[PDB]
Design a protein around this nucleic acid. Structure first.
Ligand code: NA
Ligand code: NA
Length: 327
DNA sequence: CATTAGA
DNA sequence: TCTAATG
Protein backbone atom coordinates (compact mmCIF):
# COMPACT_ATOMS: atom_id res chain seq x y z
CA UNK A 1 0.00 0.00 0.00
CA UNK A 2 2.98 2.29 0.58
CA UNK A 3 5.93 -0.02 1.07
CA UNK A 4 5.74 -1.29 -2.45
CA UNK A 5 4.33 1.86 -4.15
CA UNK A 6 6.99 3.47 -6.52
CA UNK A 7 7.56 -0.10 -7.59
CA UNK A 8 4.02 -0.96 -8.35
CA UNK A 9 3.55 2.62 -9.46
CA UNK A 10 6.37 2.61 -11.90
CA UNK A 11 5.15 -0.82 -13.12
CA UNK A 12 1.72 0.45 -14.06
CA UNK A 13 3.35 3.42 -15.87
CA UNK A 14 5.11 0.84 -18.06
CA UNK A 15 2.06 -1.36 -18.48
CA UNK A 16 -0.30 1.41 -19.45
CA UNK A 17 2.18 2.50 -21.88
CA UNK A 18 2.59 -0.84 -23.61
CA UNK A 19 -1.00 -1.27 -24.04
CA UNK A 20 -1.72 2.34 -25.20
CA UNK A 21 1.18 3.63 -27.32
CA UNK A 22 2.16 0.07 -28.46
CA UNK A 23 -0.13 -2.73 -29.09
CA UNK A 24 1.70 -5.05 -26.63
CA UNK A 25 -1.31 -6.54 -25.06
CA UNK A 26 1.04 -9.07 -23.40
CA UNK A 27 3.87 -6.95 -22.02
CA UNK A 28 1.24 -4.75 -20.90
CA UNK A 29 -0.32 -7.75 -19.24
CA UNK A 30 3.00 -8.67 -17.83
CA UNK A 31 3.70 -5.40 -15.90
CA UNK A 32 0.37 -5.67 -14.39
CA UNK A 33 0.55 -9.14 -12.98
CA UNK A 34 3.81 -8.15 -11.49
CA UNK A 35 2.58 -4.73 -10.55
CA UNK A 36 0.03 -6.79 -8.62
CA UNK A 37 2.02 -9.46 -6.74
CA UNK A 38 4.79 -7.19 -5.78
CA UNK A 39 1.98 -5.10 -4.23
CA UNK A 40 0.79 -7.94 -2.04
CA UNK A 41 4.27 -8.61 -0.88
CA UNK A 42 4.57 -7.47 2.69
CA UNK A 43 8.10 -6.29 2.66
CA UNK A 44 10.14 -3.54 1.25
CA UNK A 45 11.58 -4.74 -1.99
CA UNK A 46 15.19 -4.21 -1.52
CA UNK A 47 16.45 -5.27 -4.83
CA UNK A 48 15.92 -6.89 -8.17
CA UNK A 49 16.68 -10.31 -7.01
CA UNK A 50 14.34 -10.14 -4.04
CA UNK A 51 11.59 -9.31 -6.40
CA UNK A 52 12.66 -11.72 -9.08
CA UNK A 53 11.69 -14.51 -6.61
CA UNK A 54 8.22 -13.41 -7.16
CA UNK A 55 5.68 -14.89 -9.48
CA UNK A 56 5.45 -13.00 -12.82
CA UNK A 57 8.74 -11.47 -11.92
CA UNK A 58 11.06 -11.65 -14.64
CA UNK A 59 14.48 -10.56 -15.16
CA UNK A 60 13.25 -7.83 -17.49
CA UNK A 61 11.30 -6.24 -14.84
CA UNK A 62 13.67 -7.15 -12.07
CA UNK A 63 16.15 -5.19 -14.11
CA UNK A 64 13.70 -2.28 -13.97
CA UNK A 65 13.51 -2.31 -10.16
CA UNK A 66 17.30 -2.15 -9.72
CA UNK A 67 17.61 0.93 -11.73
CA UNK A 68 14.64 2.39 -9.98
CA UNK A 69 15.67 1.23 -6.59
CA UNK A 70 19.15 2.41 -7.31
CA UNK A 71 18.53 5.87 -8.95
CA UNK A 72 15.44 7.71 -7.90
CA UNK A 73 13.97 7.22 -11.42
CA UNK A 74 13.82 5.36 -14.73
CA UNK A 75 15.25 6.16 -18.21
CA UNK A 76 12.42 4.65 -20.24
CA UNK A 77 10.08 6.12 -17.77
CA UNK A 78 11.83 9.32 -18.50
CA UNK A 79 12.16 8.53 -22.18
CA UNK A 80 8.26 7.92 -22.54
CA UNK A 81 7.20 10.86 -20.45
CA UNK A 82 8.85 13.16 -23.01
CA UNK A 83 7.71 11.64 -26.37
CA UNK A 84 5.20 13.82 -28.02
CA UNK A 85 3.89 10.89 -29.88
CA UNK A 86 3.18 8.73 -27.06
CA UNK A 87 2.34 11.97 -25.25
CA UNK A 88 -0.02 12.80 -27.99
CA UNK A 89 -1.72 9.44 -27.71
CA UNK A 90 -2.25 9.85 -24.09
CA UNK A 91 -4.28 13.06 -24.65
CA UNK A 92 -6.48 12.27 -27.64
CA UNK A 93 -7.58 9.30 -25.66
CA UNK A 94 -9.37 11.80 -23.41
CA UNK A 95 -11.87 12.86 -25.95
CA UNK A 96 -15.00 10.78 -25.32
CA UNK A 97 -15.13 8.38 -28.16
CA UNK A 98 -11.49 8.08 -28.69
CA UNK A 99 -9.91 4.96 -27.63
CA UNK A 100 -6.19 4.16 -28.35
CA UNK A 101 -6.77 2.46 -31.57
CA UNK A 102 -8.20 5.54 -32.95
CA UNK A 103 -5.89 7.62 -30.92
CA UNK A 104 -2.94 6.15 -32.79
CA UNK A 105 -4.68 6.32 -36.14
CA UNK A 106 -5.27 9.96 -35.52
CA UNK A 107 -1.69 10.63 -34.77
CA UNK A 108 -0.22 8.93 -37.68
CA UNK A 109 -2.39 11.10 -39.59
CA UNK A 110 -0.75 13.90 -37.70
CA UNK A 111 -3.77 14.83 -35.50
CA UNK A 112 -2.18 15.53 -32.23
CA UNK A 113 -3.77 18.62 -30.83
CA UNK A 114 -7.31 19.56 -29.87
CA UNK A 115 -7.29 21.92 -32.80
CA UNK A 116 -6.29 19.05 -35.20
CA UNK A 117 -9.26 17.40 -34.07
CA UNK A 118 -11.09 20.58 -35.00
CA UNK A 119 -9.80 21.11 -38.42
CA UNK A 120 -10.51 17.62 -39.08
CA UNK A 121 -13.78 17.44 -37.43
CA UNK A 122 -14.69 15.52 -40.49
CA UNK A 123 -12.68 12.40 -39.54
CA UNK A 124 -14.66 11.98 -36.36
CA UNK A 125 -17.89 9.95 -35.92
CA UNK A 126 -20.86 11.34 -33.97
CA UNK A 127 -19.76 10.03 -30.55
CA UNK A 128 -16.49 11.67 -30.95
CA UNK A 129 -17.80 14.86 -32.32
CA UNK A 130 -19.82 15.16 -29.33
CA UNK A 131 -16.90 14.29 -27.20
CA UNK A 132 -14.90 16.93 -28.88
CA UNK A 133 -17.77 19.39 -28.49
CA UNK A 134 -18.10 19.11 -24.74
CA UNK A 135 -14.38 18.57 -24.05
CA UNK A 136 -14.25 21.11 -21.11
CA UNK A 137 -17.73 20.01 -19.72
CA UNK A 138 -17.04 16.31 -19.77
CA UNK A 139 -13.89 16.63 -17.91
CA UNK A 140 -15.52 18.86 -15.20
CA UNK A 141 -16.88 17.21 -11.98
CA UNK A 142 -20.69 17.04 -11.05
CA UNK A 143 -21.74 18.95 -7.82
CA UNK A 144 -24.19 17.12 -5.76
CA UNK A 145 -25.98 20.46 -5.57
CA UNK A 146 -26.56 20.03 -9.35
CA UNK A 147 -26.80 16.26 -8.89
CA UNK A 148 -29.87 16.99 -6.74
CA UNK A 149 -31.65 19.14 -9.24
CA UNK A 150 -30.79 16.77 -11.91
CA UNK A 151 -32.13 13.83 -10.19
CA UNK A 152 -35.05 15.97 -9.43
CA UNK A 153 -36.03 16.36 -13.02
CA UNK A 154 -35.44 12.84 -14.36
CA UNK A 155 -37.84 11.45 -11.76
CA UNK A 156 -40.74 13.78 -12.57
CA UNK A 157 -40.67 12.95 -16.19
CA UNK A 158 -40.34 9.22 -15.66
CA UNK A 159 -43.17 9.52 -13.35
CA UNK A 160 -45.14 11.67 -15.64
CA UNK A 161 -44.60 9.49 -18.63
CA UNK A 162 -45.73 6.35 -16.88
CA UNK A 163 -46.26 5.96 -13.22
CA UNK A 164 -45.45 2.25 -13.10
CA UNK A 165 -41.70 3.30 -13.68
CA UNK A 166 -39.11 2.92 -11.03
CA UNK A 167 -35.86 5.05 -11.32
CA UNK A 168 -32.83 5.12 -9.29
CA UNK A 169 -29.78 7.15 -9.56
CA UNK A 170 -27.18 4.73 -8.48
CA UNK A 171 -23.48 5.51 -8.11
CA UNK A 172 -21.41 7.69 -5.68
CA UNK A 173 -24.10 10.18 -5.64
CA UNK A 174 -26.34 7.46 -4.32
CA UNK A 175 -23.68 6.73 -1.74
CA UNK A 176 -23.38 10.26 -0.38
CA UNK A 177 -20.44 11.55 -2.58
CA UNK A 178 -20.15 15.34 -2.65
CA UNK A 179 -19.63 15.11 -6.41
CA UNK A 180 -20.02 12.67 -9.23
CA UNK A 181 -18.76 12.28 -12.80
CA UNK A 182 -21.92 11.57 -14.56
CA UNK A 183 -25.36 10.74 -13.66
CA UNK A 184 -26.48 7.03 -13.84
CA UNK A 185 -30.21 6.27 -13.65
CA UNK A 186 -31.27 2.59 -13.21
CA UNK A 187 -34.46 1.80 -14.89
CA UNK A 188 -37.22 -0.74 -14.57
CA UNK A 189 -40.77 -1.27 -14.91
CA UNK A 190 -43.12 -4.09 -13.91
CA UNK A 191 -44.20 -4.95 -17.42
CA UNK A 192 -40.50 -5.77 -17.87
CA UNK A 193 -38.76 -8.59 -16.22
CA UNK A 194 -36.71 -11.64 -17.38
CA UNK A 195 -39.18 -13.58 -19.60
CA UNK A 196 -41.58 -10.86 -20.97
CA UNK A 197 -40.30 -10.35 -24.51
CA UNK A 198 -39.11 -6.78 -24.15
CA UNK A 199 -40.84 -3.46 -24.69
CA UNK A 200 -38.13 -1.31 -26.12
CA UNK A 201 -40.44 1.60 -26.06
CA UNK A 202 -40.19 1.46 -22.35
CA UNK A 203 -36.77 2.81 -22.93
CA UNK A 204 -37.60 5.14 -25.72
CA UNK A 205 -40.63 6.66 -24.09
CA UNK A 206 -38.62 8.37 -21.51
CA UNK A 207 -35.71 9.38 -23.56
CA UNK A 208 -38.29 11.24 -25.53
CA UNK A 209 -39.59 12.92 -22.51
CA UNK A 210 -36.27 14.02 -21.15
CA UNK A 211 -35.46 15.30 -24.53
CA UNK A 212 -38.81 16.72 -25.05
CA UNK A 213 -38.34 18.97 -22.20
CA UNK A 214 -34.63 19.70 -23.03
CA UNK A 215 -32.71 17.80 -20.47
CA UNK A 216 -31.19 15.42 -22.89
CA UNK A 217 -29.61 17.59 -25.40
CA UNK A 218 -27.60 15.03 -27.39
CA UNK A 219 -27.42 11.31 -27.93
CA UNK A 220 -24.10 9.33 -27.84
CA UNK A 221 -26.03 6.17 -28.33
CA UNK A 222 -29.42 4.73 -27.94
CA UNK A 223 -30.16 0.99 -27.80
CA UNK A 224 -33.32 -0.79 -26.73
CA UNK A 225 -31.84 -1.14 -23.19
CA UNK A 226 -29.04 1.38 -22.87
CA UNK A 227 -29.21 4.90 -23.84
CA UNK A 228 -25.92 6.90 -23.56
CA UNK A 229 -26.33 10.75 -23.67
CA UNK A 230 -25.66 14.33 -22.67
CA UNK A 231 -27.73 16.47 -20.20
CA UNK A 232 -28.04 20.09 -19.19
CA UNK A 233 -29.74 22.09 -16.47
CA UNK A 234 -31.83 24.89 -17.67
CA UNK A 235 -29.75 27.86 -17.35
CA UNK A 236 -31.75 29.82 -14.86
CA UNK A 237 -32.61 33.39 -15.47
CA UNK A 238 -29.49 33.92 -17.32
CA UNK A 239 -25.96 34.78 -16.58
CA UNK A 240 -25.21 31.18 -15.51
CA UNK A 241 -25.38 28.32 -18.04
CA UNK A 242 -24.86 24.79 -16.84
CA UNK A 243 -22.12 22.42 -17.94
CA UNK A 244 -22.99 19.59 -20.35
CA UNK A 245 -23.17 16.38 -18.44
CA UNK A 246 -22.98 12.81 -19.28
CA UNK A 247 -26.06 10.99 -18.56
CA UNK A 248 -26.71 7.21 -18.97
CA UNK A 249 -30.02 5.42 -18.69
CA UNK A 250 -30.59 1.64 -18.81
CA UNK A 251 -33.63 -0.61 -18.86
CA UNK A 252 -33.93 -3.50 -16.41
CA UNK A 253 -36.24 -6.30 -15.73
CA UNK A 254 -38.26 -5.69 -12.72
CA UNK A 255 -37.03 -9.00 -11.54
CA UNK A 256 -33.39 -7.86 -11.40
CA UNK A 257 -33.36 -4.27 -10.28
CA UNK A 258 -32.19 -4.61 -6.62
CA UNK A 259 -29.14 -6.83 -7.21
CA UNK A 260 -28.42 -4.58 -10.07
CA UNK A 261 -29.13 -1.52 -8.09
CA UNK A 262 -27.15 -3.04 -5.22
CA UNK A 263 -24.40 -3.48 -7.49
CA UNK A 264 -24.19 -0.10 -9.23
CA UNK A 265 -24.09 1.58 -5.93
CA UNK A 266 -20.91 -0.08 -4.81
CA UNK A 267 -18.51 0.79 -3.60
CA UNK A 268 -16.33 -1.44 -5.78
CA UNK A 269 -15.10 -2.64 -2.38
CA UNK A 270 -18.37 -2.99 -0.57
CA UNK A 271 -19.59 -5.20 -3.37
CA UNK A 272 -16.69 -7.59 -3.13
CA UNK A 273 -16.96 -7.88 0.62
CA UNK A 274 -20.63 -8.24 0.50
CA UNK A 275 -19.91 -10.59 -2.47
CA UNK A 276 -17.22 -12.44 -0.58
CA UNK A 277 -19.56 -12.69 2.38
CA UNK A 278 -22.52 -14.12 0.53
CA UNK A 279 -20.09 -17.04 -0.49
CA UNK A 280 -19.90 -18.35 3.00
CA UNK A 281 -23.43 -17.63 4.09
CA UNK A 282 -24.43 -20.25 1.42
CA UNK A 283 -24.49 -17.92 -1.68
CA UNK A 284 -23.48 -16.09 -4.82
CA UNK A 285 -24.21 -12.61 -5.95
CA UNK A 286 -23.71 -10.82 -9.29
CA UNK A 287 -24.94 -7.85 -11.29
CA UNK A 288 -28.46 -9.67 -11.56
CA UNK A 289 -29.31 -12.44 -9.13
CA UNK A 290 -28.52 -14.33 -5.91
CA UNK A 291 -28.40 -18.08 -6.25
CA UNK A 292 -28.25 -20.51 -3.28
CA UNK A 293 -25.20 -22.68 -3.24
CA UNK A 294 -25.20 -26.47 -3.67
CA UNK A 295 -22.37 -28.48 -2.16
CA UNK A 296 -21.68 -30.44 -5.38
CA UNK A 297 -19.25 -27.65 -6.16
CA UNK A 298 -21.72 -25.16 -7.68
CA UNK A 299 -25.44 -24.48 -7.99
CA UNK A 300 -28.22 -22.29 -9.49
CA UNK A 301 -31.83 -21.12 -8.72
CA UNK A 302 -32.42 -17.26 -8.51
CA UNK A 303 -33.86 -16.33 -5.20
CA UNK A 304 -36.57 -13.53 -5.25
CA UNK A 305 -35.77 -9.87 -4.42
CA UNK A 306 -38.27 -6.99 -3.60
CA UNK A 307 -35.76 -4.58 -1.95
CA UNK A 308 -32.05 -3.99 -1.23
CA UNK A 309 -33.05 -5.54 2.07
CA UNK A 310 -33.89 -9.06 0.59
CA UNK A 311 -30.46 -9.48 -0.82
CA UNK A 312 -29.14 -8.37 2.62
CA UNK A 313 -31.37 -10.64 4.82
CA UNK A 314 -30.56 -13.46 2.49
CA UNK A 315 -26.91 -13.51 3.17
CA UNK A 316 -27.71 -12.63 6.76
CA UNK A 317 -26.19 -9.11 7.00
CA UNK A 318 -27.03 -5.82 8.55
CA UNK A 319 -28.78 -3.48 6.09
CA UNK A 320 -26.11 -1.01 5.21
CA UNK A 321 -27.35 2.31 3.98
CA UNK A 322 -26.01 3.52 0.75
CA UNK A 323 -24.43 6.33 2.68
CA UNK A 324 -22.42 3.62 4.35
CA UNK A 325 -21.70 1.27 1.37
CA UNK A 326 -18.23 2.75 1.62
CA UNK A 327 -16.52 -0.57 2.05
C1' DC B 1 -18.40 -8.13 -19.64
C1' DA B 2 -21.97 -6.38 -22.26
C1' DT B 3 -24.16 -3.32 -25.13
C1' DT B 4 -24.03 -0.22 -29.22
C1' DA B 5 -21.58 1.99 -33.43
C1' DG B 6 -19.83 1.36 -37.55
C1' DA B 7 -17.71 -0.29 -41.61
C1' DT C 1 -19.57 -10.07 -39.27
C1' DC C 2 -15.76 -7.89 -36.41
C1' DT C 3 -13.71 -4.41 -33.91
C1' DA C 4 -13.75 -0.42 -30.94
C1' DA C 5 -15.19 2.26 -26.99
C1' DT C 6 -17.91 3.03 -22.57
C1' DG C 7 -19.24 1.90 -18.27
NA1 NA D 1 -11.86 8.86 -24.86
NA1 NA E 1 -8.70 -12.87 -33.66
Amino acid sequence: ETLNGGITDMLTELANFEKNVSQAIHKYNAYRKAASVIAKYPHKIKSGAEAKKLPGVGTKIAEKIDEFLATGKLRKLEKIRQDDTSSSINFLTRVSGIGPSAARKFVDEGIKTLEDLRKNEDKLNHHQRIGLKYFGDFEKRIPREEMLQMQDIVLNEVKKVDSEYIATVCGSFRRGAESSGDMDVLLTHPSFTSESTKQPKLLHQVVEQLQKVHFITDTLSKGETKFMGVCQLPSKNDEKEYPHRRIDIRLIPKDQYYCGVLYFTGSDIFNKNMRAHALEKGFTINEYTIRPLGVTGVAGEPLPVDSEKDIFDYIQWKYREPKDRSE
